[PDB]
């Protein structure tokens, strides 16, 4: 019985998130079509990402719809045969589909934000803590792309997680970082 | 017991110490084919095949210690895969 109740709760959460994502997608593509009609040309994906971030910052409603319409008229907006006709219409539809895919990717970037919004809605319907600390930031000569590309064993060979321990003394951490930050060793690991 | 058994019949009612089943399998069973459960344990063998083509029934010859009154409606009875033969055989050839 508990397994059945858990499955029903999971299904309800999934369909609520689906409804929220479809509502955001259709509202965003409507305001994007209006902004494209006013602008008269194609809109950059950076403006769509900024609009998605603005709609993520403030809770969406009719007042937030008016705010999004004002932001579509803001200073950021001002800063920015027959078979052939059918093919051009199909290309315009494909461009609209690509814009919708970009909006879907933006919503996928805020997918856990949508899950948090759904959790807040569920809490409204109903109505310890893992703590981190700030430390000295060292990238150790590696950007995030090369961290993601490298293997876990290769990264552990480069430097261990216990080397930059949160409470290790600064002398030993500096001594390890000096040896790691050698250009020859970094080049050898990159070749490896 | 065979490793793979397929669901063959559903309990209908007892009849004179035999178990009547509506067939929940598309194919026809072999005569005297053993009838199993999900536990792979034999309850008996197929005694008689009867009924129309759309609605096939079969009666099971119950073994020792297996009583027809002990089973209830909705019980499923299982048969081995090699003990089924296609219904096209009994129909006349074109």
């Amino acid at each position: 019985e508990k397994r059945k109740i858990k499955e029903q709760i999971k299904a309800e959460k999934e369909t609520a998130l689906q409804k929220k994502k479809t509502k955001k997608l259709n509202k965003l593509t409507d305001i994007l079509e209006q902004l494209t009609k006013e602008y008269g040309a194609e809109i950059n994906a950076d403006m769509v990402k900024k609009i998605t971030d603005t709609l993520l910052k403030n809770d969406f409603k009719e007042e937030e719809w008016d705010n999004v319409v004002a932001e579509l008229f803001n200073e950021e907006f001002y800063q920015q045969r027959k078979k052939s006709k059918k093919e051009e219409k199909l290309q315009k539809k494909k461009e609209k589909r690509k814009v919708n895919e970009l909006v879907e990717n933006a919503l996928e970037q805020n997918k856990l934000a949508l899950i948090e919004e759904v959790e807040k809605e569920e809490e409204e319907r109903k109505s310890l803590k893992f703590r981190y600390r700030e430390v000295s930031p060292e990238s150790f000569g590696l950007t995030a792309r090369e961290i993601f590309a490298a293997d876990d064993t290769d990264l552990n060979e480069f430097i261990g997680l216990k080397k930059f321990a949160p409470y290790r003394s600064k002398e030993l951490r500096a001594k390890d970082k000096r040896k790691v930050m050698k250009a020859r060793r970094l080049r050898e690991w990159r070749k490896k | 017991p065979p490793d793979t058994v397929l669901e063959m019949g559903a309990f209908l009612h007892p009849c004179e110490g035999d178990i009547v089943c509506r067939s929940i399998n598309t194919k026809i069973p072999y005569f005297n084919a053993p009838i199993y459960l999900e536990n792979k344990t034999q309850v008996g063998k197929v005694d008689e095949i009867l009924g129309p083509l759309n609605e096939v029934f079969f009666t099971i010859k119950c073994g020792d210690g297996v009583q027809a009154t002990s089973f209830k409606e909705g019980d499923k009875f299982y048969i081995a895969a090699d003990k089924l033969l296609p219904i096209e055989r009994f129909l006349p050839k074109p």
Partner: protein, 61 residues
């Protein structure tokens, strides 16, 4: 064509069910020849084209 008497081993709770059962046995049917018949006993399909229940006595079974 046949006119046949069936004897039931027990009295039916519902009379009309007998007729319904006869209506279930009309059509193409799976039959095996009995032990007394000289024909080899293999499962065949035999068609009953039309059947009609003339009478039924549930007390006489």
């Amino acid at each position: 064509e046949y006119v046949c008497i069936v004897r039931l081993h027990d009295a039916l709770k519902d009379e009309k069910d007998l007729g319904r059962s006869l209506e279930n046995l009309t059509g193409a049917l799976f039959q095996r020849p009995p032990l007394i018949s000289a024909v080899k006993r293999q499962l065949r399909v035999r068609t009953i084209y039309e059947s009609n229940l003339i009478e039924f006595d549930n007390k006489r079974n």
